[PDB]
């Protein structure tokens, strides 16, 4: 399924080239510009654990998730991954725990040492 496919067929987008964050572009977005550091980014996402459980979805809340890019407000994989996206793009990200919640995990759903799968849509980005 999609997690296996991004695991085996994704592109490493880390600066360290350590395969900690792999990406597939599922829907090509608009033009060439990606967000810049500090921009307000608006995303929709779905996250799955490596046991197949869905642990979060913005679609189910009927509102996007909004954060400031590149400020460590989200897991490292999201700062790195969203920074590579164009407006209107949908991608898959496969995140090793060193770019997610590490050995700590995150209550209630994310265990220690968890590899995570996301589908992310970049709805919009704006400077403030």
């Amino acid at each position: 399924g999609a997690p296996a496919t991004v695991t085996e067929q994704g592109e490493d987008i880390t600066s360290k080239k350590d395969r900690g964050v792999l990406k597939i572009v599922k829907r090509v977005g608009n033009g060439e510009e990606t967000p810049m550091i500090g921009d307000k980014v608006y995303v929709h996402y779905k996250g799955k654990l490596s046991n197949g459980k869905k642990f979060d979805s913005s679609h189910d809340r009927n509102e996007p998730f909004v954060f400031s890019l590149g400020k460590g407000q989200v897991i490292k994989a999201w700062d790195i991954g969203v920074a590579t996206m164009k407006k209107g793009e949908i991608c898959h990200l496969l995140c090793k725990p060193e770019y997610a919640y590490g050995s700590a995990g995150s209550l209630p759903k994310i265990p220690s040492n968890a590899t995570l799968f996301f589908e992310i849509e970049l709805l919009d980005f704006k400077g403030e």
Partner: peptide
């Protein structure tokens, strides 16, 4: 918690 941190 997620997706903060």
């Amino acid at each position: 918690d997620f997706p903060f941190v």
